[PDB]
Symmetry: D4
Subunit: 242 residues, 8 copies
Amino acid sequence: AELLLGVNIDHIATLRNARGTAYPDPVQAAFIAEQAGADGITVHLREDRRHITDRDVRILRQTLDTRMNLEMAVTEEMLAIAVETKPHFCCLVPEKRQEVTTEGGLDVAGQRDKMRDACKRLADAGIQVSLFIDADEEQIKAAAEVGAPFIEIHTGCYADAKTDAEQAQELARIAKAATFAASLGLKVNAGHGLTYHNVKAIAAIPEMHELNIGHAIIGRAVMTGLKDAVAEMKRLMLEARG
Amino acid sequence: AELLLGVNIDHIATLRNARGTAYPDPVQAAFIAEQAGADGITVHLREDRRHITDRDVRILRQTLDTRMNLEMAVTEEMLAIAVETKPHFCCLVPEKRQEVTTEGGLDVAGQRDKMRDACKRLADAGIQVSLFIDADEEQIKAAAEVGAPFIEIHTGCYADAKTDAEQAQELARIAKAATFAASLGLKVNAGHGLTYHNVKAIAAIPEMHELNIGHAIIGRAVMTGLKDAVAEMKRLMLEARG
Amino acid sequence: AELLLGVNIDHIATLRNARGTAYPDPVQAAFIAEQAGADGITVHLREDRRHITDRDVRILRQTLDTRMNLEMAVTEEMLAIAVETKPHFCCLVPEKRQEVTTEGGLDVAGQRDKMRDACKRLADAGIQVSLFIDADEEQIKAAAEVGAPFIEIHTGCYADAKTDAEQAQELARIAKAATFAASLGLKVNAGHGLTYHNVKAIAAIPEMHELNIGHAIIGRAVMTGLKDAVAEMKRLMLEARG
Amino acid sequence: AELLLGVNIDHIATLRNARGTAYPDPVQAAFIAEQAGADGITVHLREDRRHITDRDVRILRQTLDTRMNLEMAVTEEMLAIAVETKPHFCCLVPEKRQEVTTEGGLDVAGQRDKMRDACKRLADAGIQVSLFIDADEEQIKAAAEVGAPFIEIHTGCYADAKTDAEQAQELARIAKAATFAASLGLKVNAGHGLTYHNVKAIAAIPEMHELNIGHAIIGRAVMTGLKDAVAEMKRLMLEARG
Amino acid sequence: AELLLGVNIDHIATLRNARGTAYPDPVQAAFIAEQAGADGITVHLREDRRHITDRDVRILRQTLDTRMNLEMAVTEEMLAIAVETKPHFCCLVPEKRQEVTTEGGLDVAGQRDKMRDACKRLADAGIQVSLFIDADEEQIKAAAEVGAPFIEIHTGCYADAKTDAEQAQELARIAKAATFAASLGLKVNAGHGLTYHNVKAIAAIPEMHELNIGHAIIGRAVMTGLKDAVAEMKRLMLEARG
Amino acid sequence: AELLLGVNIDHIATLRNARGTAYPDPVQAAFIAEQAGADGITVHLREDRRHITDRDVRILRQTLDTRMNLEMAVTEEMLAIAVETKPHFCCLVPEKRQEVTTEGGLDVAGQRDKMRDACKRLADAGIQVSLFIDADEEQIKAAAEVGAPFIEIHTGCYADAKTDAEQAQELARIAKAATFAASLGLKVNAGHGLTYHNVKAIAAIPEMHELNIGHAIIGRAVMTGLKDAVAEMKRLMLEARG
Amino acid sequence: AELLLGVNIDHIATLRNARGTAYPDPVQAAFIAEQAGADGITVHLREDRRHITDRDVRILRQTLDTRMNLEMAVTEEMLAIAVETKPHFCCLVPEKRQEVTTEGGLDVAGQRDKMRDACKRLADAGIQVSLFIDADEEQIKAAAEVGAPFIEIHTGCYADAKTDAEQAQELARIAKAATFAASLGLKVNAGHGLTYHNVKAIAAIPEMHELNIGHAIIGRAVMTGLKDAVAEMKRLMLEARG
Amino acid sequence: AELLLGVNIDHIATLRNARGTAYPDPVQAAFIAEQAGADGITVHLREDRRHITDRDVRILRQTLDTRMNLEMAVTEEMLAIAVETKPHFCCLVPEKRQEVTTEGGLDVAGQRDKMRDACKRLADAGIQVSLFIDADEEQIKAAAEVGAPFIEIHTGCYADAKTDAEQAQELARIAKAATFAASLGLKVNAGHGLTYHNVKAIAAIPEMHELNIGHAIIGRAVMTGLKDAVAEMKRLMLEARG
């Protein structure tokens, strides 16, 4: 069971929206990445459409050769959109202060009914749901209890570690959380903030299923090209596992 | 006298500022482009520091191997900064509705004193000033009258042409403006909005001195890498001239 | 301007339809071509949707950064599809033997009424029409009379030339045909069957506006990759005109 | 233990044939592939020679540097050619409806006389025979009972699996079919319809001797070139066993 | 018109023959070079089949996409092989003491009877003949009387030029000889011995039709690979005429 | 430990010597290969200096960054050259009828006196000696008694193996012979005749110390360039031991 | 973690200072290395600023995406510079002969007071200290006693080993030294003089934390380019530990 | 008319020497450069052999495939070596203060006896001599009066020009100096300190025969590799003349 990699192309759109032209087109990047080590493409459809737009989602859904992971907030609009779109995966994320925790994860343990409804609903649509949460066992437990098949652990605190001791600390937390989530029947993803220098430690955690990385790749891309940027990340990820 | 190309790296910073990390770093891109066909690097130091930051300007000024073109508004702050920085070039641009025209060019013909002061001031600092203006002969004339050594014609209307007839129209206007500006002792640049498909027609206009292109290059870069993106643009630009 | 390259990506889809998978996708090929030297993308919507399908046209129309040239037979179905799709260019080709001539181009001189009608109806939709015809003065004069802004000379016979003498003769004929056509106010294209070894003599012809090439490019792509295949064809074309 | 890759270049030919030209030439693709990770080259010599032709087989036979794997229907014409051509391997496949099962595999269970004879005849010419069958125990036993050295499991259903569950269900089917086939002294292959995204789980299966892949490889090749298409596939395969 | 390049791939077979293996296979080099700047492929079927063998010719004749230039001695064996093979071109070269010049080229002045017969016989077969001679007037007049449509000047002496004077003189000798041949209605070629550093002076000679180079190309190819080697040669040649 | 690769660059000089030119120059190949996977460079100073010449050895001895493996016949001339040259290694090979085996390797069992003298004399000079012998016990015992520290098994017969049976047997023969040699205190090498498709089985033999390959590498290099050719071989070797 | 690579870019600046230009700039090299396999960048601020200057350190400190390892002599000037610069790592090296030992590493066992002081003062600035010393137990025990968290074993002698025996001996010594050092709670690095051909034996040593390499990498960069030079060194290092 | 490029590989050696190793080796750089656009290779054999050494010159002389240009001070030691070494070109340069003018050039005007003798002596050994002088009429006349075939104008001041005006002033100086030098029968060169950014204006100057560049090329090479560094420079030079 190879460690999978989902490439988030959101920032290709960031770059496009700055001038309101058609380029660069997320649709092209998706092709490059899928053929360069990406097992899935991730797009976050924000409410304010900062980058990825409804057009993007609509055409990508028809052009992706692998599968879509729709990052979105738990709101009527987005729930409706995802059910309509039928993405293979859906990643629920906070987008406001009430749904967010002190670390930026989805507050599941405090919104059990809302999350329960959302999960069954997305599941009836044939969508595999992933609740984006902190390496918090309480949230991890609640996630399991509301029926999500996946949870994506927030690796941002780890990415932003200011000292090695602080980083090693966040690593351990993440690792124990993953092990705990698995013992609950959850498959577990991570990836937020991961870079070419801190990706290996996470990739090594056995419970990890897939890593959703975006920015570091797109940031490497402007220099070296998307093909090599994605390929390097996948190479490093597999090395971590061997 | 080879047609020169200045690569605007602003959007590398756009990409960086989206997540507040250090990468991608404009400093790296500047190296790649200078060695890939760029005769100068252009950075726009906006008042709100959307992308390029004071850090950027400060280090770039020490790392560029060619020369800096500081795009900036005519305000006390920016005038002070540029005098302090001593860029080789300075490109005055509108950033508000009063300094802008109906086309987005710097309103020179209506602010002669402000522009006159700015030009002599930047010139005393040893800076070669370029007034960013529309292909308007009135503005072109005023630009000459206030003492600017350069003017950069706004090629955006041309870039955004919706029909070929409309485009050919904007081309002619641009070409006659350039010829007119030259007969006034001005050296003339262009470049805003130019892309890999419409760059040749502009590059062919003999009066053109240097083209300041940014977005299309950076947008091509996320796919192919900055090296080739800059090189392709310079290749197309020189073909236009032969 | 300079000789333009219209890349026909039909065979990308013949490879696809040979299996029923979604790969390779013409949408990707189009992006690669548009960035490798192609000034337009061409697709031939056959009545039997043998390669290019309606889905290809619908999506391509939204993804192309340049413009679409739609080759199609002159039937109510296609004209309706074409009027609705609104591509920049349209090239009317024969699909049935009662449509073809001795050498293989559209038969305009014999179907002036239908052709006059088509041209009018497509031009009304804002589409610029081109009639694919043999290097035949009769057909060329008729193309003009019916209102077409373009004609595309069928370069097959020249590409199929079995001897050096037969080739030089076909060449001369194409060139004299092009000049005549121009004298009638027509803009002229070509490209069918053109290859890496025989494209220069055609590109050297001054009246040539755009060369639409497919098979030879795709044929080189399977070995080399589309990016280089296209850039090569383009390079050769511009060398011929210098 | 060392997983071999067998590249099928049939679709290089389909491309060519869609036009009647000499290119792209299968003979070229074989050199490229044999030097990019291919251990053998496969060609399916169909009755209607829709792609690979008698010339191809005649020249490929004198130009391959590794070995030929002739795919063919069980007929007198083919057996006769195979015996004469003396290819290293031979893969008996269904071309007609009365010789194919309900899922696609060659119907050996229901043609034991025909197959027993094919095998003895081909084996008598020093050709190692493989029967292209479904992952079905009844067919595998017939295969062994008749004497074939090899069998090639049809991964068609696994490749076409719509849901993840449906895919895992089909994987287990193949893996148990292979283990079983091995217990009866058969060497087992696969490959039909495998892609850069599903090949690994099949390559992980121990009993696999050689994987015969074609379409996905050629489909990647029109984009990246045959060399990298072939080298990637090989790399993924060995990664799966590592 | 277009200055052409014939690539002699003889030395590919030279590397092969030093071992009795099948690699490297001339057939592969051919595809590579024709797709990288070669306009024709040249092979010299020596009597002793030192490198090129009958199978090479037999198969190349079937795989070449451009055309064959068969270099050969004048012997009944070779004339029959040539008439059977029907290569597009035939270059008659000296292989024995009695047929050579002290300078190395074919002694046509001394074998007027033989050569006349060869030119006629090869001509009725539809083969364009070239005589490999020295930049000598007597041999050129001989070549002319005998009926050869082409001549290939021996650029050997120029290539081994020891001083800058010695070289400039041989250059001049060829330039005049080429003009002399043309005034006689002969088309002229050269190439033998030409390298990456001395080719341009020869390519610049107006009367030159095609350059038949092999050894310096193969010698560069062992380091950089055939493709770039061939492409690089072609480029230097085109640079010479620009 | 590390399985090593000695690259025989003899055939570089073979291409050169076919013309008396200075290119390709063995000295260049050496730098290329040592920097691409070679751990040593091997040259065979034949008596007739067919390829490698004294200057090659004289200069290589000065430019090599790793070390020289001098292949040579046992003659007073060569022993003196070797003692003078002081290459790190010396591989004694058969060049005349009286010194060869019907299989091709050095006949040590038949020249015990001569070989013993060579090993001692070359040894006092500080050269590690290897005897090029067949995978034969009598020759190995002979090599052992005479004092040679190394032996290089002749993988020729295995390389020219006609069937999969013939090959598997020669493999087995070498594997056992290698173990036999080691039990005698000899270090063992091989390589001759090994290609990109048969090298792995040999590299996997535990007792193998270094593989001295040349011809298949040069033969691949003519197409792809030395660097990738060498690097690719090295990789296959490392893959074999993993 | 995995063996880390510390790339020393000092020689980038020795190339620069050899002329007084601004190129090549170490700032660029650092970016290339950080993206090619380097986990840290090393610079040696010599008292004579022979290559790396203060400007290099000041800017690098702001541009590096990983972390700075500053090599420096133990003087008040450097310590003050180091305390202020706050690099992640500091490696104390001898610059004067009253600082060096027999083999060339720092002399800690003889200057325990100064070293205890340094370590304390640098650790107080938050810098992690490493003492560059020979593979000498006495020096290692003293490094520990004075408080250093790291030591870097001087691999020069092993890299300079004039014979295989001298090399294996130096190796064994380094390995035994590393183990001892570890038993004292010290983390151990190495790398001086390490090359592409001798780096594996050192990387294979388990106690090795990071390898700091410069000269050999830069030496390969002038030929190959930094990106590949680094990626190669890295590749070799990770192969050694697998 | 055909501008030649002469690459100086002195700094490849400075790199090497800064460490006492064998690499990087100048012999390697010369092959790379000679095959990437260099028409000759230059080496400055200084008195203190700080970079290029007697070994280098001795081996480079037997390995160059184009020709050697020996830069040296006018002394007995050097003349003697030059005469023996028999380099194709020789460039007399100042190494001491009493032999250099106020701007840098060789003082010929003030050492007519010394120079007249050097020239006659070197010329007597078949060496073409060039005097490295300033763009100063007094020195150019002395150069011609003494007999030197060539002169190499020192572009040092133009390269170091601080302001644009100062640069144009220095350019005109060089261009008039060259035209003048030409009128006296001298062949004129340049190159010192030229970069990828200022080389073109110098290459545009008609009278220029060969440009000798080194530092900028090697400085680009540590980043991109010597091949592209050399090929870019050549490309820019020819673009300037085109």
